[model samples]
Target: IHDITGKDCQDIANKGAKQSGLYFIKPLKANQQFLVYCEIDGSGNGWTVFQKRLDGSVDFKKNWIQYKEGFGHLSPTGTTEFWLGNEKIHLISTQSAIPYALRVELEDWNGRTSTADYAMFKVGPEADKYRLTYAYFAGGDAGDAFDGFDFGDDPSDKFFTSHNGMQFSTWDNDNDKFEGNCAEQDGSGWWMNKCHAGHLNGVYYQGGTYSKASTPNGYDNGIIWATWKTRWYSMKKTTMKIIPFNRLTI
Candidate 1:
């Protein structure tokens, strides 16, 4: 049997307002189902659970939109959970649509007070135990950041102008590559690529194409769906583990 102990188990407390702590649980297996549970004390607070795959990749498809609360249990048994007050979560997922890591945030308002206590377990028939590779409390500005374009005053900017029609442009980096930019033509409004940041490079003029067979003019206001190329630099390093049930048998 595996008897694995956590290497980074820490806690914190506050007296003026409220007390809170952050922890990590990791190394969960792929395709294997698990359960995560936690408990909290004080006046006002909540808890949640996040899952990342084995390769350290995040999954955004499995959206966790405020589940039930209180000192209760989670389904599937053995898992990791988060205890928080009111903080926005930015769940990052891999191309495979699987989550490899998680970030738990807590906030205190109205001068209310409370304490956070949590734990994680794996409920499976496997004989191997997992090890937590990372852990920590996400402390930062708590709120949702603008995920869409921010066209301040220059509403006529080409990027904003190409909201509906397809305008062709030469690729920036590659002289031979041509590209297109499409947006809402009637100024109705549209959302850019949910992943990428700027327009396609190598393409001339940075625009889109127009074809009755393709867009059908007024019917189809083709939207640009390019992936964001901004690099996500890790702010901190956290590791955790995931062990099988047999490894825990003493």
Candidate 2:
């Protein structure tokens, strides 16, 4: 793992990007080289991504892990998150490395459960973008938001087409190191804005500020079928799969 250095290439995932390129490889075609660079912390450090054509360089953009402090970016761009029962499952980067589509089954507070593939990527006009994609579940006031997961697949849920998001994280390029869990930096856990709402970005559940959003944030008091308990998601990305059916009994 490389620490922050004097010369780290700045890209979209950082405070900004160099120019333009597809965030993910045009496609994870077989027998191709996809070079990746990364940094999980920003404490006096840096990290970056990409092009296809395959003449030499990698075929994707750089992903930066928010600096090492202030609840510092727990999940970076291209990360996927979802819920399994009530457990928060998180997946970070290295998509080209993972052979199978990341999958998860979730039990919602709505008494409905479904399994689906997940992903993360950049969205917006070429140069301007935010982590794209999210597991679609109901949020405050019957609004919808993206989970920390960005630009992934699962044809069934086209939640992002109408909504834009920046997700929940405290990643920064010039960050000072700190000690705490993601809830602190996020002002709680699992919040994504809808149509540009709330204080930070989206409406929040107010978790882990000496307390936590451990309790369901519930939905905004108006929806055709809104429930008293709100639904949130966690994520898990992959580089490879160990076995089929990704099953675990614990």
Candidate 3:
């Protein structure tokens, strides 16, 4: 039940995504917790259904929307859900996703070692019973062939927090040290929760600052709100480009 981060597990099991420099998910018996460390992308293994758990609960506080398309802004109808509160859980995709916008950071595109995070989770019988190998999704990816997944962990630019409004647990870095909810909606900090280049959907960069008030003048959601911040830095280190959209507008 444990194999990713949080040192391996301890502390009442864990929840959301935490432990280590980001990419956590300490879920047990099927509740919550995970550290996205995917693989696969060479031959074409298989397996994919979309129902591990999904129905509600990704509202860290309410204001998730910055991935304008990749994964189709949270699946318009193709099937894609992973916000926590797992009740209906899903990632469904038989051959309908690829909206584009894949640009996992850590350096630049052309970056191989891609377990293809967000997409590529479909190839055959539930991917042969869980060993999710690859997944470099824009909206959905799969794994289990035998040569993918290497988004390669190189993060540490860690830093997260968002408190101007929506509250989202104040960017919960497990409340600042529990190691489970490393915040990143936009309102404060994170020097080790940035977990950069993990599972970015549509991407954003109009900058942020909610709650205490500031980014309200035209809160069009400018962009940047889904969850997870693989060591997302500040210093204007923006990036995006996964191409191939057909919906999710903008």
Candidate 4:
């Protein structure tokens, strides 16, 4: 075990802090501190929002370095699209003795909401290119898309194309198995296989069809959760949050 100069949302909540806002957290072995948006009014309370997309105000199409360090607002007053840095996420998720749980909430154009919860969630360090790892889908209306879909073999790998075990990909840093860069084709950074089973970081489109002229590559580029909705169906909002396993049980 190591020491963390700052505390995660769980520690803040445990210390009797109530209101949801921004808080500083230094990773177990990190030399510097960073900010995170905390949600205390939710069901479990003290959820550290890692990725949130709403209003399409912030562009998700960024380079590997940009994604590694994160982008968008970490506002204490209002909601805004942001991705908590991959390095920070890897550090916090693997910091404690107890693991962390992932909660992904989605809202479609119709305003209908759904959630996907994983009992154990983690991201590998930079050496591993921030590979995704999560298991035990407790419950959710959004469907287990992350580990659900299988498109047979793609010549490169016989295994299925699930986002769970894939490495992060971007236009500049191609890590996916696809012949062309998945991040370039999809227009967002994510743990992509052939592409993704669930790509919440894709281009945000309004409630309409993404034209072929606009996206010659494909229409799956929208903020999509394939199992819950089709690849072309762009969701209205999405939020990915995490909390210590001991702090909340599914």
Candidate 5:
């Protein structure tokens, strides 16, 4: 956490190295499986994914199940996906400390190590809310993006006015808060953008505003506005809930 935020000397020294880590305090359900997805550049890349069983026994390393080769040159990003299934063990959850790690390595066309990044998530049962931590390191030229969940809304609704017509929320660093708002003008309520196809470098929130149509100074103004943008580069540790069967549940 300190490293990713440049709060320490190590992070300051390795500011451009492209590394990150996270921890989750939620326990895995027995026999449950999860789809883990990631994207990285494709010059020369490798990754390791694993799970720590409840018994303290280590599961063998597995390649990321979802991966695309020779795709980076075509686009700025390549993706990896994998499924992690619990073996139906009912061992007690970790009470002290539990750790899981993911590692990524890549090389540049010059055969130099382009970037090396690692992330870890702690697993356990605590309070109702899951505790999470993530960190990343980037080279002078390395970059990445992550998406968690999406909520879709009716595009034709009178309350929807955004080109995407969906409302969503992400952590805003500048305001140091979570912002959300609807994108429609008729005040149909806030909607989530499930497609994640807009504004790669910005975070948005959904809400509503009131306005009068005939103030004697306006023509068509009786609709509510539901869209707003936050300052750029103002987000950190963006995350959303994992719904098993669909996109965002709420």
Candidate 6:
């Protein structure tokens, strides 16, 4: 087992704190600790949640600076929608003993939950515009929406349209592949590559189907996992969490 030092949710779990709830974690080399929600994984190990969307109360459409700092509540009571800040996520995911595993839990309108797990995940520093990188689709029913099927580092070389290695883009920050701003077209911040195959940070609609006229972009602006539920269909609930790779089997 890795050292049970207090660094992140995995470390807290290593110290025998198995219960899932809110906890303050100090990322390695970070100036200060911050509040985050912890959830027990399939093996009863802790995973730190970074993004969550249940109800459409919290607006996902925001500016670049807003996304970097994060927004919304961290579940003061039970499962409040929020984004646990990009800088924090970059700090925690990159400052771990082992590579982190990214897990995305998606729930459709019918209450059916599916998962997408990556064996390795990392986010670059702000200088690199928080470029996304992931490898080896561990296993999940969500069907590899981010990179299609991948086991390599270069996202651009992937078989399908990949969001891997893509810099983060928001409505104001036009750093995507599309001729037009993907964020402005999609109405949310994401690692957009001609838009996306899995745009989790999107307008959360009340139901699965939303009209193009109702969205800000006059397009499909709802939580999307195109492989599972077409881009036009909005998801019901979603939680993006991460855990140290070493704890994946625990």
Best by TM-score: 4
Candidate 3 vs. truth: CA RMSD?
A: 17.0
Q: Which ten residues in a row have the lowest lDDT in candidate 3?
A: 44-53
Q: Write the per-residue lDDT of candidate 5 for residues 1-250, one digit (tens) a residue.
A: 2222221112222334233222111223433322222121232121112211111122112211111010111111222211122111011112223222222232222333222222332221223111223333221222222122111335533222221212222221011111332222111111123212112212111121222332343211121111111111111111111111111112
Better by lDDT, candidate 3 or 1: 3
> Tens digits of per-residue lDDT for model 3 on 114-185?
222333332212222111222433432222112212233333222222111111123432223324443344
Residue range 125-205, candidate 6, lDDT tens digits: 889888889878788898788874332435743443477888999999888887888898777888887667788998778
Report how far off residue 42 is in candidate 6 (Å): 7.9
The number of residue pairs in model 3 that clash at the backbone is 86
lDDT of 1 at 229: 15
Cα deviation of 133, candidate 3, in Å: 13
TM-score of each: 0.21, 0.24, 0.23, 0.89, 0.22, 0.88
Q: Pick out the ten consecutive residues of candidate 6 with the lowest summed lDDT.
A: 148-157
- Model 1, 1-250: lDDT tens digits are 1122121111111112222223232222223212232111353221223321111122111111221111222233323222110111111111122222223222122222221111222121111111111222222232111122333435533344221121111111111111332222211111122212222111111123433444234322222211211111111111122221122223
lDDT of each: 0.21, 0.24, 0.24, 0.80, 0.21, 0.80
Q: Which parts of model 5 are misplaced by more than 4 Å?
A: 1-98, 102-116, 122-131, 135-176, 179-250
lDDT of 3: 0.24
Q: Which 10 successive residues of model 1 have the least lDDT summed? A: 84-93
lDDT (Cα) of model 5 = 0.21
Worst 10 residues of 4 by lDDT: 151-160
Q: Which wins on TM-score, candidate 2 or candidate 4?
A: 4
Better of 3 and 5 by lDDT: 3
